[PDB]
Amino acid sequence: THPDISVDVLVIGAGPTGLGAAKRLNQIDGPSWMIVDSNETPGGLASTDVTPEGFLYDVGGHVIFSHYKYFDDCLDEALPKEDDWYTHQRISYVRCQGQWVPYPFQNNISMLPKEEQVKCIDGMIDAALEARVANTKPKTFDEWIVRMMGTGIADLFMRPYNFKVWAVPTTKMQCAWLGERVAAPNLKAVTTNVILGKTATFRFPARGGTGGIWIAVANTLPKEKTRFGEKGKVTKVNANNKTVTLQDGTTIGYKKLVSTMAVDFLAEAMNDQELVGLTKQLFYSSTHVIGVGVRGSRPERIGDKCWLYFPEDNCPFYRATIFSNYSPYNQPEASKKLPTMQLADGSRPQSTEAKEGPYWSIMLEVSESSMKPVNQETILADCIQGLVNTEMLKPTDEIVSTYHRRFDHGYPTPTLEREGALTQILPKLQDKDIWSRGRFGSWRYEVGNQDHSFMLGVEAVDNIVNGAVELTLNYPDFVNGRQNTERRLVDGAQVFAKSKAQLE
Amino acid sequence: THPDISVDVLVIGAGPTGLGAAKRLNQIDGPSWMIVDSNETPGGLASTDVTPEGFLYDVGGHVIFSHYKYFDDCLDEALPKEDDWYTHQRISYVRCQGQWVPYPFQNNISMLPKEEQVKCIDGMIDAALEARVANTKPKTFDEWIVRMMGTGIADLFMRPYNFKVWAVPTTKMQCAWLGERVAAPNLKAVTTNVILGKTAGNWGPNATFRFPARGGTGGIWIAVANTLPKEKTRFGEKGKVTKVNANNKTVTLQDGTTIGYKKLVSTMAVDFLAEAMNDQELVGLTKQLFYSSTHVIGVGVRGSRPERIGDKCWLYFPEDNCPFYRATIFSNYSPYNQPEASKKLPTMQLADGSRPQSTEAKEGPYWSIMLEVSESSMKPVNQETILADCIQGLVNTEMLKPTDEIVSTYHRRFDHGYPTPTLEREGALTQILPKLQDKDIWSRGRFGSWRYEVGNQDHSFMLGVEAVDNIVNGAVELTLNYPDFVNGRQNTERRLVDGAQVFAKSKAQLE
Amino acid sequence: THPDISVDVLVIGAGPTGLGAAKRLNQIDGPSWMIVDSNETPGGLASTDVTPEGFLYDVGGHVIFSHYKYFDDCLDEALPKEDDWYTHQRISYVRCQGQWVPYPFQNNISMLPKEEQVKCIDGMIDAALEARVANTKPKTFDEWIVRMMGTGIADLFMRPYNFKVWAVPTTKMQCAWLGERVAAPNLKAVTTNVILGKTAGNWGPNATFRFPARGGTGGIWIAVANTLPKEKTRFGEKGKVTKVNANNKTVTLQDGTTIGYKKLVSTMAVDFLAEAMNDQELVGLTKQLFYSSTHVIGVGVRGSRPERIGDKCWLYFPEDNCPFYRATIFSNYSPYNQPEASKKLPTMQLADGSRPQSTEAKEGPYWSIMLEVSESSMKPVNQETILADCIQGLVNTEMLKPTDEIVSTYHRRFDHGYPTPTLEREGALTQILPKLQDKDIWSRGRFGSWRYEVGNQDHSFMLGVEAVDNIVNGAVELTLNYPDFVNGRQNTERRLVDGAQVFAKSKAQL
Amino acid sequence: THPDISVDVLVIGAGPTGLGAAKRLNQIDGPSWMIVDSNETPGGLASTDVTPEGFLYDVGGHVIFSHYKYFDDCLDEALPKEDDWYTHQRISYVRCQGQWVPYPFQNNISMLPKEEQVKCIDGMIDAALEARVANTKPKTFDEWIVRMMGTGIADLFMRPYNFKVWAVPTTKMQCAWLGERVAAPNLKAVTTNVILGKTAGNWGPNATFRFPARGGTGGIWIAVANTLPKEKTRFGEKGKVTKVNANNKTVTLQDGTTIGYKKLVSTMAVDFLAEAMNDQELVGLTKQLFYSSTHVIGVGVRGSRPERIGDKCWLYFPEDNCPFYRATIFSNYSPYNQPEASKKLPTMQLADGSRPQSTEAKEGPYWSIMLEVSESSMKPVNQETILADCIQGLVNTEMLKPTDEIVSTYHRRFDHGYPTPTLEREGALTQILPKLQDKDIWSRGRFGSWRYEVGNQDHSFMLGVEAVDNIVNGAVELTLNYPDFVNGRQNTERRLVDGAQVFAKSKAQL
Ligand SMILES: [Cl-]
Ligand SMILES: [Cl-]
Numbered sequence A: 001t002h003p004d005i006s007v008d009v010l011v012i013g014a015g016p017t018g019l020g021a022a023k024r025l026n027q028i029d030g031p032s033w034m035i036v037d038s039n040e041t042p043g044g045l046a047s048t049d050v051t052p053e054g055f056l057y058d059v060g061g062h063v064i065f066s067h068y069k070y071f072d073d074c075l076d077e078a079l080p081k082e083d084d085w086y087t088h089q090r091i092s093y094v095r096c097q098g099q100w101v102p103y104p105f106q107n108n109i110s111m112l113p114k115e116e117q118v119k120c121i122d123g124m125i126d127a128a129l130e131a132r133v134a135n136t137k138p139k140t141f142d143e144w145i146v147r148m149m150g151t152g153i154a155d156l157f158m159r160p161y162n163f164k165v166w167a168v169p170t171t172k173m174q175c176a177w178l179g180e181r182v183a184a185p186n187l188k189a190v191t192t193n194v195i196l197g198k199t200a201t202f203r204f205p206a207r208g209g210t211g212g213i214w215i216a217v218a219n220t221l222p223k224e225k226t227r228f229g230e231k232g233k234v235t236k237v238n239a240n241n242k243t244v245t246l247q248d249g250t251t252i253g254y255k256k257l258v259s260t261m262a263v264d265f266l267a268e269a270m271n272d273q274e275l276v277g278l279t280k281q282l283f284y285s286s287t288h289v290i291g292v293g294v295r296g297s298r299p300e301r302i303g304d305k306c307w308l309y310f311p312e313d314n315c316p317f318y319r320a321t322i323f324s325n326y327s328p329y330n331q332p333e334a335s336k337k338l339p340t341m342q343l344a345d346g347s348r349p350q351s352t353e354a355k356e357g358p359y360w361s362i363m364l365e366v367s368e369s370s371m372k373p374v375n376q377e378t379i380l381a382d383c384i385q386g387l388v389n390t391e392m393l394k395p396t397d398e399i400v401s402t403y404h405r406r407f408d409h410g411y412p413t414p415t416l417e418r419e420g421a422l423t424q425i426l427p428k429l430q431d432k433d434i435w436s437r438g439r440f441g442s443w444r445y446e447v448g449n450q451d452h453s454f455m456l457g458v459e460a461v462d463n464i465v466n467g468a469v470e471l472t473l474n475y476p477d478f479v480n481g482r483q484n485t486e487r488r489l490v491d492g493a494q495v496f497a498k499s500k501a502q503l504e
Numbered sequence B: 001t002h003p004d005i006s007v008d009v010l011v012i013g014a015g016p017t018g019l020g021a022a023k024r025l026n027q028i029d030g031p032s033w034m035i036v037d038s039n040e041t042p043g044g045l046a047s048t049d050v051t052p053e054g055f056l057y058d059v060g061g062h063v064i065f066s067h068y069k070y071f072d073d074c075l076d077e078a079l080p081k082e083d084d085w086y087t088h089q090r091i092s093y094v095r096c097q098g099q100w101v102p103y104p105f106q107n108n109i110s111m112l113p114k115e116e117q118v119k120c121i122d123g124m125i126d127a128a129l130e131a132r133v134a135n136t137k138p139k140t141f142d143e144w145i146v147r148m149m150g151t152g153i154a155d156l157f158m159r160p161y162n163f164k165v166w167a168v169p170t171t172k173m174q175c176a177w178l179g180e181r182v183a184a185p186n187l188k189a190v191t192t193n194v195i196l197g198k199t200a201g202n203w204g205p206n207a208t209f210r211f212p213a214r215g216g217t218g219g220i221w222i223a224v225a226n227t228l229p230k231e232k233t234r235f236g237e238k239g240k241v242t243k244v245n246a247n248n249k250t251v252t253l254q255d256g257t258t259i260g261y262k263k264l265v266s267t268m269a270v271d272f273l274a275e276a277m278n279d280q281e282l283v284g285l286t287k288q289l290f291y292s293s294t295h296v297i298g299v300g301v302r303g304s305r306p307e308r309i310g311d312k313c314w315l316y317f318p319e320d321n322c323p324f325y326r327a328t329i330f331s332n333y334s335p336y337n338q339p340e341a342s343k344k345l346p347t348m349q350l351a352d353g354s355r356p357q358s359t360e361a362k363e364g365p366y367w368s369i370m371l372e373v374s375e376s377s378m379k380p381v382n383q384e385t386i387l388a389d390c391i392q393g394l395v396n397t398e399m400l401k402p403t404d405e406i407v408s409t410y411h412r413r414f415d416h417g418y419p420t421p422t423l424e425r426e427g428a429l430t431q432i433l434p435k436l437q438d439k440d441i442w443s444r445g446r447f448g449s450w451r452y453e454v455g456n457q458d459h460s461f462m463l464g465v466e467a468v469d470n471i472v473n474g475a476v477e478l479t480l481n482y483p484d485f486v487n488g489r490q491n492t493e494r495r496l497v498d499g500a501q502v503f504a505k506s507k508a509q510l511e
Numbered sequence C, D: 001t002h003p004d005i006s007v008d009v010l011v012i013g014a015g016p017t018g019l020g021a022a023k024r025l026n027q028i029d030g031p032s033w034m035i036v037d038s039n040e041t042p043g044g045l046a047s048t049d050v051t052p053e054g055f056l057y058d059v060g061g062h063v064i065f066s067h068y069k070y071f072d073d074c075l076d077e078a079l080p081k082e083d084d085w086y087t088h089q090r091i092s093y094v095r096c097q098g099q100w101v102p103y104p105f106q107n108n109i110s111m112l113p114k115e116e117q118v119k120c121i122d123g124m125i126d127a128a129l130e131a132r133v134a135n136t137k138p139k140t141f142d143e144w145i146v147r148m149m150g151t152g153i154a155d156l157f158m159r160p161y162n163f164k165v166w167a168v169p170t171t172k173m174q175c176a177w178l179g180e181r182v183a184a185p186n187l188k189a190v191t192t193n194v195i196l197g198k199t200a201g202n203w204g205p206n207a208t209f210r211f212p213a214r215g216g217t218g219g220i221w222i223a224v225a226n227t228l229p230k231e232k233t234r235f236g237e238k239g240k241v242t243k244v245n246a247n248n249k250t251v252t253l254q255d256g257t258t259i260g261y262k263k264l265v266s267t268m269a270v271d272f273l274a275e276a277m278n279d280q281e282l283v284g285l286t287k288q289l290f291y292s293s294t295h296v297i298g299v300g301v302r303g304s305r306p307e308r309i310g311d312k313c314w315l316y317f318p319e320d321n322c323p324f325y326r327a328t329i330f331s332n333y334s335p336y337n338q339p340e341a342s343k344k345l346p347t348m349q350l351a352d353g354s355r356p357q358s359t360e361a362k363e364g365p366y367w368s369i370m371l372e373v374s375e376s377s378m379k380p381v382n383q384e385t386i387l388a389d390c391i392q393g394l395v396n397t398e399m400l401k402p403t404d405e406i407v408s409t410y411h412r413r414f415d416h417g418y419p420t421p422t423l424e425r426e427g428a429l430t431q432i433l434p435k436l437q438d439k440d441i442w443s444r445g446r447f448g449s450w451r452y453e454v455g456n457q458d459h460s461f462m463l464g465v466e467a468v469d470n471i472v473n474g475a476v477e478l479t480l481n482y483p484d485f486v487n488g489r490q491n492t493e494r495r496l497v498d499g500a501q502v503f504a505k506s507k508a509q510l
Helices: A016-028 A068-078 A105-112 A114-131 A141-165 A187-195 A211-218 A263-270 A272-279 A379-388 A419-429 A450-467 A476-480 A492-502 B016-028 B070-077 B105-111 B112-133 B141-148 B151-166 B187-196 B218-225 B270-277 B280-287 B384-396 B425-437 B459-472 B483-487 B499-510 C017-027 C069-078 C106-113 C115-130 C140-165 C189-194 C216-225 C272-279 C280-287 C386-398 C426-438 C456-471 C485-489 C499-509 D014-028 D069-078 D107-111 D112-132 D142-151 D151-168 D187-195 D218-226 D270-277 D280-287 D384-394 D425-436 D459-471 D484-485 D499-508
Strands: A005-012 A033-035 A049-050 A056-057 A085-089 A091-096 A099-102 A199-205 A227-229 A234-238 A243-245 A251-259 A284-295 A308-311 A319-321 A359-368 A398-412 A434-436 B005-012 B033-037 B085-088 B093-096 B099-102 B209-212 B233-235 B241-247 B250-253 B256-267 B291-302 B314-316 B325-326 B367-373 B405-419 B441-443 C005-012 C033-037 C048-050 C056-058 C083-088 C093-096 C100-102 C208-211 C234-235 C243-244 C250-255 C257-266 C291-302 C313-315 C325-329 C365-377 C405-419 C442-443 D009-012 D033-037 D048-050 D057-059 D085-089 D092-096 D098-104 D206-214 D233-235 D243-247 D250-252 D259-262 D263-266 D291-302 D314-316 D326-328 D368-373 D403-420 D441-443
Touching: A005 A450, A005 D326, A016 A187, A016 A211, A049 A211, A068 B085, A068 D326, A091 A105, A091 A141, A091 B233, A091 D263, A099 A105, A099 C106, A105 A114, A105 A141, A105 A187, A105 D206, A114 A141, A114 A187, A114 B112, A114 B187, A141 A359, A141 D243, A187 B112, A187 B187, A199 A243, A234 A263, A234 B187, A251 D033, A251 D499, A263 A272, A263 A434, A263 C083, A263 D233, A272 D033, A284 A379, A319 D499, A359 A379, A359 B459, A379 A398, A398 B085, A398 B270, A398 B499, A419 A434, A434 A450, A450 A476, A450 C189, A450 D459, A492 C250, A492 D459, B005 B016, B005 B141, B005 B459, B016 B033, B016 B218, B070 B218, B070 B459, B070 C208, B085 D218, B093 B151, B105 B151, B105 B187, B105 C257, B112 B151, B112 B187, B141 B151, B141 D057, B151 B367, B209 B367, B233 C280, B233 D403, B241 B270, B256 B459, B270 B280, B270 B425, B270 B441, B280 B425, B291 B384, B314 B367, B367 B384, B367 D326, B384 B405, B425 D425, B441 B459, B441 C234, B441 C280, B483 D425, B499 C005, B499 C456, C005 C017, C017 C033, C056 C365, C069 C216, C069 C456, C093 C140, C100 C216, C106 C115, C106 C140, C115 D112, C115 D187, C140 C365, C189 D112, C189 D187, C243 C272, C257 C456, C257 C485, C272 C280, C272 C426, C272 C442, C291 C386, C325 D314, C365 C386, C365 C405, C386 C405, C426 C442, C442 C485, C456 C485, C485 D291, D009 D459, D014 D218, D014 D459, D048 D218, D069 D218, D069 D459, D085 D151, D107 D187, D112 D142, D112 D151, D142 D280, D151 D368, D243 D270, D263 D459, D270 D280, D270 D425, D368 D384, D384 D403, D425 D441, D441 D459, D459 D484
Parallel strands: A005 A033, A005 A251, A033 A227, A091 A308, A251 A434, B005 B033, B005 B256, B033 B233, B093 B314, B256 B441, C005 C033, C005 C257, C033 C234, C093 C313, C257 C442, D009 D033, D009 D263, D033 D233, D092 D314, D263 D441
Antiparallel strands: A049 A056, A085 A199, A091 A099, A234 A243, A243 A251, A284 A359, A284 A398, A308 A319, A319 A359, B085 B209, B093 B099, B241 B250, B250 B256, B291 B367, B291 B405, B314 B325, B325 B367, C048 C056, C083 C208, C093 C100, C243 C250, C250 C257, C291 C365, C291 C405, C313 C325, C325 C365, D048 D057, D085 D206, D092 D098, D243 D250, D250 D259, D291 D368, D291 D403, D314 D326, D326 D368
16 A cells, blocks of 8 residues: 655655755755645745735744854845845844833843842842852753842843743743853943943845745745645654655655654644653743734834833733834835724724825734733733833824734743653654654754754754754754854755766 | 169150050059150150141141040040040041042042943952952952952052052051951942942041140140159150160160169160160161151141131042142141131242242131151152142142142151051061060050051050050050950940059048 | 948859959959858869768869969969879760760761761761852851761761750850851861871870869869958858849848948859849849759779770760760879778679679779769759669760679759850840949859850859959950950960069068 | 876875775765775774784774764674674773772772872862862863862872873873863762772673774774775875875875875875975974874783783873883783784793793793883983883883793884874964865864874774765764764764665665
8 A cells, every 4th residue: 555655755844944854855856855834835933924904024033143054055045136135233122111221131221220220230249259159050040040140130121021921930941941151140241331321233035024035945946846735734644654644635655754843733643642741741832923003104212123122011012023124015115005993092093094104013922821821802902002101102103004813832932841851752753763843843942043943954854864963953052152154055965966967 | 783763664755655654553553663755745756746837737637536445534534624625527538530539438439430430340349259269368468458459449549549658569568457447348339339329438437536626636645644743754855765774674864864673664666775775686676677757747828718628637649649648637626726817927938839929927817737748768758849849739639729828837757657567577576575575674655566556546555554554463465466356346444443443542531 | 221241342152253253352452352152162063072982073074274374373372282283184085886086076087987987078078168168157056066077977976965965956056155266177187087097196295184182173172262361251151142232232141141342243143143133124134044954973983993994084975875975084083082992882783783792891992983964944854763874874885894883873963054055145145244234243154154165164263353353453354255365365464473462562571 | 187087085094084084985975086095004003013923913002982873883894793803891900009000090099008098188179179169271281180180199190191191291281172071079989989998889781892803903994994995995105195286186196196186085194294285384384283103012922811910901100110101911802912822932032131041932822912102302212222111111010020931022113193282282273274174175183183082093983984074965073173072972873874875775776
């Protein structure tokens, strides 16, 4: 009994991780392979949605720093024109007590009341003294924060903010994921800034938002090796006889499997009780992505802002961005005409006539868990009110468009129990020739950015084919702390082979 | 052959130390005793001079702050009237970059330029981190400074200032002496003040303090001397000691008088004692000691008390725009330190150095300033020019406008001014003092025992008292050997009227 | 209404503290004074008792190290002959796991089993490392113990021993009383002795102490008292004080006699003084103080001095195979502490607790053992069985063979035995003493001021001397308030003959 | 103008490193390649020599612990029979004051004089206390040692031994090359062993290493080379490289042959390369490197194996009663390292250095010893007398009785023996390697990249493998730049058969 299709390497999922595996498989051009996804549009959670009124919203952020030349090579290939990209300056602010405090927070306590500055400085002094004598390392995220910042800064920012982000207490999280850097505060730089009173770029696609990158990357692949859409939905994986079954009944035989779906779904699709049980020990939070389109020129108070962080309790979201700042093509042009749905204060607008722009746009994120639930019916309104309370929207601003989507698997949580589970789950799948990789494929946030995830797929294939170490998967500190320039979209294998076929 | 006079206990010198010995001897009224001094006016280096134009000057605007009730008892006995004393609150600043920084220098960085504050705070951060782990103690004054303040504050103040005071580099002095002299900065306190822009200025035991209404500090010692039986004192040329024969326990006076003693308390500089003894070994050891001379400069000036001056007491001068290290507004201590307003005086010169528009005697009121300048083999001074240089320094510091009228000048150089706490000091004293002790000589006092940590007038007085108490009652000489012990407590046990005098008095009535 | 007697200074109590006050007063010979004691024989709890069979036992130890020349002058004066004293070598042992471990204990773990040595060294390594980084000081005796010794050595000796001594857990006691010495171990010396297997060679002649030839320690205090003008002493029932009226400064004796004073030096237990004053506030504060009772047991036995026992001095007992915390072969201190050989005595019992085979009086020679047992609310003792338990304890520790013949026993219980350095002590004393001071009452002594660190005979003596020096000459009471200061120096200034007496005498001849 | 030969990848040198490159290139079977060596026999400085009398001696030691599955695969493929290998227990001893001190030295101070134990333990106590508080990293090999062991152990072993090894004082060497773990001594374990006097634990299966039955170590590389296609190798005089033109990527051989390359893997000493390149700048930088020469000495002797020396071990010699720093009983590794019993040989001399009694050829059995002596401008050696001195050293260390019959001797001096981890090494290499890289030259190996940390046979093999992987597949050269990473993990990902070959083979069957 033979499957409808047979390939050496099967890739499940066409998010960044799956596309990475596909790109390196395509480059190597050795073993046979194919990639499937239930979504007709590749990009997974790094896709970009659009509102009926033409406002774009990324559902999974954007890369700010690439750690790898290989990732760069693929983006350059996908979007090879200078005008394909806008290049912006890396910046950030924290919203604290009516102030926009620049990153890094501790280096700008100067902008807080003098009383708060005292509590913060006393906190770092204590922490700096203890660190001088420390002979152990922190065991929880919380301990890490305190040793690093002092109780002062920890209570102002780190603690409350991180709870808003992870939907889980900082006491319930590990810290290893943060890196090897010794937990020791830079007291001198902090006080120096307090006394003096004083206080890097990234590219973003011009059109299509982040999702446009992955569409263009996928378009470089040989179309007949892709199966995207309902015809590409996987319904079961038979690990014992290495066969996958799709929704439409198609069967696929594989020798090695690279699975980028959530590892808990994989265990279900495998009907593996042991893996399902191990898999349930993992924790994750859901996230709500909220989009707000509004009429008007970009407000003075807002400027060239990007990520904004919100520790305080006058708004449910933990971060927001002025998405309209990243690219003029993220929202409709001025000439386009749209009706006002409501004002920022939640009341009916004066006129309901479709009017001109220009427009700007805000995007934000709310976290959710069994330890921090959210009312889905009221969350949109609360967020908008939150934009008011934080002085991002005037109560008079006119809202032209709203976007609200909830993602069940939003963040894989770095809980104290994560590694105990992963060190069992991953090797067990490995023994079955299954490479489970990705944000939820391998569940490691420290390597959960688009560039990391992409490379997790690239390296899994490199392990399958060339016996390479999976460095990003098992040594995040090693890859994050170096320049990764060795692996290129064009390696010696292809140069030599191409040159050979030329004089032959 | 007998000497002209014989006493159980002879006291040489009638400064604070000798007078302290005399007072306890007089209170005990047991063994016979007498006290001699080459000066006709008692008070030693705690005396007061006056210019022909009527301006009083101490040897450093002395200030009474006592660690002993017994010292208090004697001052109260000598000057028993409420109006004998003015009581003040210390108003002090350090002169740094056109600013008056309040006394605990470190708590007032908030008054320095921001750039400087940074260097200071960085310095303390380092020091605080090394202190958390230190397992040794400082060996020099300099290491002590750095470990306490950080290189920042050390360079801005401590180092330059202390060289101006001691006429010796901080790296050449020990550090077992500064317990109650130099403040101990706390990181939190300091940074909290720099944040709040608020101040603090109560450190040290100098903060109320009483000063004598009349005659200056010297007036205290004259009044104390007057409590003694005059016939047991020998003050003047007739009291000048020329020779000390330790072997047959006899002293020789200038007029040839000979005095036999059983026990000698000597308050003259220990290096002079060696000479007077004709003892080569001691003269030698004596050489290994070090001291700095000091110039006391007085300046009287016409005018109302400038509000730019205010109620300043002693001001500190680390910077190089003036020769003096410390200065005081003496006219602030008492209305009797300078002539009253009605008195008429001619202007001698203007602060800038030029002649006065008129050489006619004019009224007051008046105010007064006293300066000190240190001198040594490592930091010489030009005696002919030093007076002018100081006046010029008063200008550069904005104490005197170039326009101010100088009515009175005073200048006097004291050879023995400060007993220098060098690194070699204790190595010398731990030989000199025991050797004198074996001859039944109690050498005590500012230059008698040469320890600055107990060199104030109250310490010195008590060195004399305690020497007598050891001689007579077998008391421990606590102030001499344990400065930290006496400075760290209230010494209230020893009184001008002890149980011994009460019991003997009440027995005399019943009999 | 005038009292039957009036003096400038009244001293209550003729223990070492009282006698100290009397001696300085007698030397000064200025203000008038007298000294009373309810006991006919001076010496207080530093006296020496005797059994009907002629065995001596010190009730309150003996001085091993004198910190003062003044104390020396007075003992020299009291017992001026060379043959008035024996001079012995200073040494000590701890009884641990069948071993006599020499002082100090930590430097001799070599004698213990290797397993136990491991735990000890491990504990001190930890302590050493923590001390390298410590920035706080110990708050309890227990913490002080651990930081100094480590848990290993602490559990073997310090902890169990100290609980047996103070009859109070170490966690309940302060540690300032131990001095200002940094709580930290000398790892190198301890590991050096474990490796070398040897201890520091005998420093002989080494630190020696002197002990009186006759009459025991109590003999010192009888002779000291005899240098006093007898008419100024009132010892006996005729000297028992029943009431102290602080307000009009009057003291009332048993026989009804009334004494008026200007200054009072009271060396009786400060809680008894509170009582005798009828001051409720004081009595109240006085309750906050804690003390343990002690049992002094004496055993006289027949035979030459056995090989196993050795040469005198204190022995310490951490373990639970005996109720006592320390003991000493008293008969080693002087041949006059017990009957000579020719004396004939009947065996009372054997060490095992059984009747002897013969009850006929027989020759000696003899030897003798003295030991102490503490008692308190947290560590009670059965007064009927304690003697037997102690004797059995002597067998268990291998001090007596079960066959050894017991000729004499001695058992006496002292209500006030040790003033306990509890965490609460200073909070109470810093109120009690100043308050008594404001009434011209100098409460001084082992129980007069309640401070064990200055509770030895020389210290207590000097508390008396210094109180008088404060009353008369305004001297600082150094021993009372700065024990670390006096223990850390050579106190040579104050002498039995001071300059005052020299000058005065020299003048009387002229 | 075209060269006689053109390949994609040219490999110079057929030692472990060169053969490593060749193995991976051969496995990949993609780009064309060839490998050249001036030696007719492959093995480089890991080859085996034989004396005329039939005694074998490794010139470059043997692997004790392999860090890579890939290295294991290749050794397995080359020597696939069970009886191709012997497997021994990995142990080690240090010769200190007449004793054989087992590894590790510190855990065995027990068998030294008690006085030495004292200095050692005292040293570690200091080190341990400073380590509690340290906030900086060691800057020299010497400081690292002091912080690790303390001055006591440093003086007894570390300092003297390492000078004998590196021919350079420890103060002149870096320490990063040693690893990343903090310099903190395990004091408890050290003192626990001294106390217990033992060196034991609950234990499990003992650690082992394998050694080739025949041909010695050099037999591995001969067999590894044999698995390569012979026509892609050029070994012997015909393979000697004399010139390297980096600008037009051409190499010239002794016999005038020219070889064009696209990428070069050079395993010859990097100084020689700079010379062969005629590149002034690289010659200059190259001068800043430092190395020591080494003498390898072999001694065949008659007799059964003496009980005094029985194990297949290294022996280390800190003391100055012998010029060599390490030695081993090679005859213990394999019966085939020396002539069999029946073989008859004449005696050349006795251990004492005197003529034999009879010059007749006599049977065995035989055993063998080999040892090493360093040499440099800071520690010269007399080449004429070195053999005798070493033999005499063997006597002084009680390895040879003065009566032992020496049947065979061996002496050979390698100019490039150890690449020295000097303080200036990295400053030089961080310029040299990258500059060669920019010319498409991968200089790799013991003296190719000059890093002792990764200079073992397995490390070197892998330097070759990873260089090929970087050239072809863009792999990270982990062994080259991250020794700590590769040494602290099990490297199992890279196999002699990877997916690429499985997929390719399986495809060719459809
Ligand atoms: Cl930040
Ligand atoms: Cl060396």
